[PDB]
Every structure is written in structure tokens, then in C-alpha cells.
Design a protein around this nucleic acid. Sequence first.
DNA 1: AGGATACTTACAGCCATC
DNA 2: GATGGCTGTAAGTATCCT
Length: 1118
Amino acid sequence: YRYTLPVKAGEQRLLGELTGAACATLVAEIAERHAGPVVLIAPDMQNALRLHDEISQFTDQMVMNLADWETLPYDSFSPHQDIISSRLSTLYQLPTMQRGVLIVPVNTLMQRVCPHSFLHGHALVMKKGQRLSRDALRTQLDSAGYRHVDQVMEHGEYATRGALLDLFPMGSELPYRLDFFDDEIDSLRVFDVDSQRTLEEVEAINLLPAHEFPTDKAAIELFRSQWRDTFEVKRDPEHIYQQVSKGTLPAGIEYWQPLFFSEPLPPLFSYFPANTLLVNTGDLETSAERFQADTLARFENRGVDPMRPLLPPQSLWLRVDELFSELKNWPRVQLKTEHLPTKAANANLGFQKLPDLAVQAQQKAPLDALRKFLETFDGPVVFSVESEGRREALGELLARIKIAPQRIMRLDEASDRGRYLMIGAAEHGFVDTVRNLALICESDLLGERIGQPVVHLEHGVGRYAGMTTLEAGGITGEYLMLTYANDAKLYVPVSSLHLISRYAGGAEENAPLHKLGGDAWSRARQKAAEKVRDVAAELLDIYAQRAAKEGFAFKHDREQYQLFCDSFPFETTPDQAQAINAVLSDMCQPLAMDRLVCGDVGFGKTEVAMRAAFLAVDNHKQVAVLVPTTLLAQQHYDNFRDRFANWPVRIEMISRFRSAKEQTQILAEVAEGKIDILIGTHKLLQSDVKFKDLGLLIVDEEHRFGVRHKERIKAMRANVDILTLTATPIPRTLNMAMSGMRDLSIIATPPARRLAVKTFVREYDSMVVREAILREILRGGQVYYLYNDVENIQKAAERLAELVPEARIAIGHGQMRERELERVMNDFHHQRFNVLVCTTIIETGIDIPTANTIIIERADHFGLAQLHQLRGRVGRSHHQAYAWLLTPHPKAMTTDAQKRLEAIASLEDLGAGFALATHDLEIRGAGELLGEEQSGSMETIGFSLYMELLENAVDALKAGREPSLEDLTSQQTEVELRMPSLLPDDFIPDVNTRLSFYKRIASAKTENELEEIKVELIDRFGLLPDPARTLLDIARLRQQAQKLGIRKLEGNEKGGVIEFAEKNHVNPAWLIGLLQKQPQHYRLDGPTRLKFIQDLSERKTRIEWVRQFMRELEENAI
DNA sequence: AGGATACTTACAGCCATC
DNA sequence: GATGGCTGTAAGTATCCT
């Protein structure tokens, strides 16, 4: 209490001296101190996006928010089905709600409603409890706007089997199976279609109006009449209005739906109950005014297309004048974080500033800063948790100060200096005086940041069996089961794992066996040494000769760079920042240019090198590429001169239009040298390609041709250098030379449009293809289709256009006029033809934004570079993405098809191992003699050892002690404590999950590694009990002791022994000190080892001793 | 052991420019 | 009025090819 709120309309009980989520959860409380529901401003999306969970921490009640359109005013990108399902779900609960809250930003409120006319266009939620017809239902669905298919994935379609028919609901993300029985229906079930399983049995079904707008024949004809009432157009058939007057659907057409009726729909102030109330933040007025400014900017500057009516934004949407004038109807919460003038409306709530929270790892007790503050104030610390692992970590590092809060879920009651905790997710916090405490965590302190063969060093080559629980010699054992010689049964220490690798070879015989230790399996080391001789000598001459290659000085003037680079409208993934900064450091480095990269022809992963175009200015030198086509060539050209426009930018190219007149211009530019760039052609290279001042070059995909052109560009480097890559290189044998010949910047952004990618394969059929079409054509999507470009491609087109009598498939014929294909590319820019396809080497180069799908037609007549090139030319941003394939029957198709099918199964994502996917395929493409002698060996013995001999060869090349140490006879420190302790099967049955955990574990060596894996496993899989925590403390003592190099431990409460490091940082002062202090718990075995004795009853006692004494030893014994 | 088949310069016709 | 020129067929070639 002691604080009030407005109770009439236009009553601004304004608020000052405020805070972040503090005042947010405050107004949550005032939601408790309020009649019904309320709403608020959002200055932007991300703010409330965080803030949802921020208050959800400290609030019993509920709140959600709409989804923003995510398009832009007079853009062309179109919104999603899912956001709009969220929006309806958010709005039509208004007339249903009594308490709880919703939210919205300053922007989507100005957008005018597609109102309850939709809702009032019922139906709505229903059940099976009726003598109910489904023909009638589907009639109400075309009233709603769903349709028929054989299989459906999104809203707007459905499919029957027999007579039972199924669909996708909107308000629920689930798919549903619908359970028809002759009006004697009994059940109704949730279903997932990548599951192909019926899942969760429901009471009811939200049969809301099932589109963005329900649009039937008359609705359509009056949209048509409506445009005709506004303005008039031509009879040209690929006008968007004319097109949809043909009963059709492009993407951004939604943008005219708000002009469906004269009666406008100002914001949703119209809808709420009288009690509901408003909120300020930042500047609604200025945000809105600049919103207007940019919308109308976009209007006039983009008000240029003839086939696209740009429209009166005041007619479309609304303005601040009438917006504040309506919301006069209700009062608000006027909030800003500051002390203010004196007015009875004002609050000036008693919040103050947190202190500075610098804690530098360099120091001794930089931690204490808080602690020294603690005694000086009554403030409890019931503060944020972000996770269960965060609870664990933060508690243990609160034992670094000898405090341990008892997590209190409630908010303000806690004691003066009450030490408790709860969940949080914010960053910035403050101080209070009305409640004399703070709201902080480490954020403000420091912020953040299977049917398997297998190969194994010590004992050979084997295969999967699982894992052998057991009672070890007085303690538990849980070991791995490996299968080799004579049913070699191997129970294996899981702690081993790091010393084992995958099958790492080809399926023929590359895990033959091992029998008796000292044998060929250890001459694995011999051949590691011979690789370390020959190919390391190759590397030696390489980085002797390829390394130096000096260059020039390249002073930055960053200001003009990022003047020119602010325009990048993919607000970057910072890994891209790693990429640019490393490569420009190589640039600014006056030495050899080299950096190897792999990504996608997928946009984003294609253009960042063009930032070096800026670097190709100040030097005032030349660059180029061989775009193997002309199509991508002018694509590049266009986006360059757009991005790179208003300053001395001058390029022409080479095309397939290369007349003698073109060629004269080529002379003109290349012998001018002023001109910036050239862009290649199939017949570019051995032409005497002319340069005066050549900075550098980039290029990709020499695949089916020889490296003829690679050595020939080796001829094209007169006192100058290169900087190239490929998106889909070969086996990295040459690129692993580049791990030694050319460093790598293979960052290529996984994130920033990680979107749905639906890629499958099915048999030859008209109707299934047609189904794919009827998925993509609904906004003018796209697939692509193939042919030999030899036989009757036109009749392919004929059949296709025939099966789709309604659409416009174009002439996708390769080897016709560059003129004609250029027109075709214009239609790709425009899509006069809503559809077109593309086939072979001289056709297929790049992925398009507006496209969404592709299909394959002869993966029975296919090939190697076919796969590995089609993999690059697929992409889409911020919508669903798709693909399918065609097959004849695998009865007909051969091994090769099945190799590619194994590939297909191995297509899931660009996750951690897309490259590993390509690699196992290239084991399926087993014919490498790249590492010629090395190939058979590393296959037989494992590319594990390839990496091993790589590192040893490299480090000992620079150290010159090359042939063999390997730590192969010994590379691991050892430990035991007599702990019945291991991974529990409580959480998971799958053992390959456990293998994964052992992967991250035995691989891990660092505090961040282990704590991060801890947080992962605990939050995903709850507070898993003690023993694996003991395994992790074992991992940490391994971290310390093997950074030190200790040899062995065996432990127990009977005592134990240690083979201490014979080679560490010793200084025996502590040894004679503990002699004088303790002979029992320190009885040194000779000068040699160290037997010890403890009555440490509980394993907690054991580890506590172990921890404190490793710390003691860190201070002393080293 | 090539070999079906995918990139390229030259030969040469028919009619376009002056 | 005469070339020539600009496309098309095809030989040499050198990439698709399992």
C-alpha cells in the first residue's frame, strides 16, 4: 500500500524514480489491485519479449502478448500463419477474459484491426457432442478457407482417408486427427505428422475462423469491385490485383485486406472493458511520429511499381492525433525512471542506483566488493536464479564467501539482510528505500560469456554392445560393452572415453580386429610417424614458402567503413564479426592473404567478403571472380552496386553476351584499370586476363573440372596474392593442408534465419508433386525441377503446365539465349510467371528469397557433384522451407541411389556435424588417395590418429622433434576413490545419450566446460543425484592434476596411494613440513609414491578433504 | 580400359549495313 | 557491292561416370 492508481478516464497518475522489472512486477501487483485486466505499451518487441518471463517470475497471474506482423509498411515480405494464430488467440480472449493481462507495442496498435467481423464470422470452439456432419464442416471450412489435399502441413488445407478427414488447427500449434465414425463418433485426438502418431485425447476443438480473413466468391468479387472503386489497372494478367481477381494468392497481399471495408478499425481500445488501463514507456508520441515518417517515406520512395498499388497510410492505419484522442477514454501508468517535479499525479517511487560491481579475475578478493557492502545495509538478497545449474554454481561460489541462501519464492517479506533466492532473468537492477534492498545477480557483476563399429587405441577395433552395470570390487561398476575378437566382451571404463574414436573407416574391413596388444595396432603409431615424416615435410615446405608472401599497408579509416557498412540489414551474427575481423586483420596484416571458408550460396553466407570491396578502394586496386555463370554474376553485380552505390564504384563484367563489342569494353576497362572488378564466365580464364593493380580475389566451385584452373591462377599471382574458399569443398585432405597452408574462417552462420526446412523423398507421381505445388503456390512460392536439357524439356513443361492448368510455369530451358535467360531472371525478380524450374550445370546456381521449396525428378539419374552442389543452392528467410524428391522404385535404383539415400537420411540440419555428414559420405565415397599412403591407414586405424599425427607433426615441426612421442604408452593421469558412483539410468534408457555425455565429459578439461555441461544436464534432466556429481569432481581434480601432470591415485577410507608427478613444479618444503606434521596421512613410499590414510566416513567427507587439499596443494604443491 | 557424354574454336552459310 | 558476321553444326576436347 501507500501507492495509488488512476480510476477515471484520462487520469494520468504518473510515476517517477522507477526501475526495470521492479516496477513491472509492481504493476503486476496492481493487477491484483485492479478490477479486471489491463494492457501496456511496448516501445518495441524485444523489451516486452523479455519482460513476459521477467514478471512471470514474480506473479501468480498470467499475461501474454500478440505476435507482431514481422513485415514492414510497404515491404514485400509477408507474415506467417503462426504469428497470426497467436494474434487471434490473444484477441478473441478479450471478450472472454476477466483477469490476467495482455501487452502490445507502439507499432501493431497503430495497425488497424481485422476485427471480430472475423470472430463474428464464427464458428468457434466445439466438441464431438452433436449429431454432426463433416461435409457440413468442410463447407464451413471453405467458408473459413481451408481446402483439400492428400496430405497437409499448414493451415488452409486438409486430407481425407476413406472418408475420415483431418486438418491443422490454428489457435493450437498441434496437428489434429479427427476420428470420424458415421455420426457415432467416440474420440478426437491430437496428432503429429513427423510423428505419424495420434497423441493426446481432447475434450474440445477451437473452430475459430480459420484464415487471416474468410474470403469467398462474393468477398472476392467485392474486393475486385472495391479496387475498381478506388482505382483502375490494366488487363495484364500478372498484376497482383488482376491475379487475385483470377482467384489467387501472392504473399504481401495481406497488406490490402485492411482496406477490405470502408469502416476502419482503429486500435483495440474499442474492445476492452471500461476498467482496463494504459501504460507509458519512452515516447509513444515520437516513436509513432517517426513510425509515420518511415511508413510514408517507404510509401513515396517505393510508390513506383505499376503492379503494386501503394496506398493511403491514413486509410490503412492511424495517427497519433486520434490515437491519444481515443485513449483519452482511459487512464494510464506513466512511467519513467527518474525524480521529477512536484505534482500530485507524480510518484517518485523510492528507488536508487545499484553500485558498480567490478570483480576482476586478476585480483585476490575482488569478490568481496559485495560482501563489504553487505554489512552496511539491511538489504536481503532474495535474488535471481536463471537455472538449476545456475543455482548449483551460484551456491558453490557463495560457499566461496561462506553464505548459502535458502531459496524463497516470495518477494518482499524476507528478513533484513535475509539470505534467500528465487528465479530471475534480467540484467540491470537498482536499489530500494521503501523496502531497502536491491535486485541483482552476476549479470550486473560480469554479465555472461547404433549398429556401430568403433576404434580404440590400446586394444584395437570393435563394435557396439551397450554398457555393463556391475558391482566392482567392493563398489559399483558401470562400464561400456564393446564387441570384438572371439566375442571379446570388453567391459570398459567410461572415464576412458576420450581415448576411443568412431569406426573412422570404410565398412569393408577397416575395423578388422585386434588380438594381443603389441602388434600392428600399435604400428598404427609407426605409420603415424611416417605420415609425420612425409606429409609433415610437405607442410614444412608449404609454410616455409606459402607463409611469407608479403603485401602492403592497409590503413583502416574505420569511420568510412562502417558508414558504408551500417547498411547491412542482417543485424549481424557476431560470428560473422569474427569472420570479418579476422580476415581484415589478414588484410591489414601486410603479409600473405589466405583464409579458407565454407558456407552456403544461401544469402548471408555469400556477401560478407564484399566488405573487402571497401578495402579494395583505399588501396585503389582490382578484384574479380569467376562466377561460373553469368546469372549469379549480374546478381552479384546488382546487389553490389545497390549496396556499394554512391561513390567511385565502376564495374563491368563478362557475360554470355560477350560480343566483340563487349570484348572491346573489356579491353577498355582492363586496360583502363580505373575500373574496379570483372566477373567471369565459363570461357574466362586462359584469356590473357589483364591487371595493373590487383588487390585480391574470391571464387568457388571448381568441382567437376580439373584443378587445371587452380594451378593456372597459380600462374596469375605476379608479386600478388589470393583469398578464396569454397562452400562445399572436397575431403579436407587438401583443406587440411590448408590447416597448414591457408587458415580458415568457416564460421558460416548457423543462426539468424534458422527456420523450418522440410526435405523428404517419395516416389514418382503426378498428384504428390501437385500437392507440393499446392503447398508453394499459395503465396507464389517456388520449387525447381530438372531435365537433361537434351530431350523434350518442353514436353516436361507441357506435362507440368498441364497438371497445373492454372499457374504460369516458364521456359527454364538451359542452352538457349543468354538474352532469354536474362528475361527469365527478370521474371524471377518479378514472377510474371508465378512458377519456373531449373536443371543442370549450366542452369542451377543459387537460392532465392521468394522461393520456398525444390524437388528432384531423377535422383535415379544423378551424381556426385549433383548432390554436393544442390546442397548449396537452397535457402529462405523467416518462413517455412521445404523440399521433396522423386524416385522410381529402389528395386530399379542401384547401390548409388542407396548411397545417396543414406545421404538423404543423413540430411537433418546444419547442426554440429554437417561436415561430419559429408565426411561419412566420403567414406561412403571411399575412393580417396589424397593422403595416398595415409588414406588406407587412417581408414584402417582412424582419422582420430590423423588429427593426432597432424597436431604432433605440426607442433614438433615448429619444435623440430618430429617422429614419435605420442603419449601413446601413457597420456592419462589416473585416479580412484572407492566410490559406488557413476551415471544413473534414472533419467534415460538410451546409452548413446550416455555416450554423448561421456563425449562432452572425457573431452572436457576446463571449469567452464564442466560447469556448462552441468547446467545443461541438470536443467534438461533435473537435479540428478550425487554420484555423477562425484564423477565431475573427479573430472575437475583431473583438470588440475593433469595441468600439473600427476600420475595416479587410488583412494578409499581404508586409505590409498598416489603415484605423484615425478615431473611437476615441485619444491619439497611442503614435503618435509608434512613429514614434521603428518607421517600417517602422508607416508611417502620411498621417494617414489605416497600412501595415505583417512577415516573420512562419508563420501562427502572424502571429496571435501580432496577439494580442500587440492587447493592446499595448489597454493603449495605444484 | 576406356567411354558416354558435356565445353569450346573453327567452317561456313545468308542475309544485313553501308 | 561486297564483305562479313553472327549464328548454327560439328570436330577436338576433356567432363560426366557409372
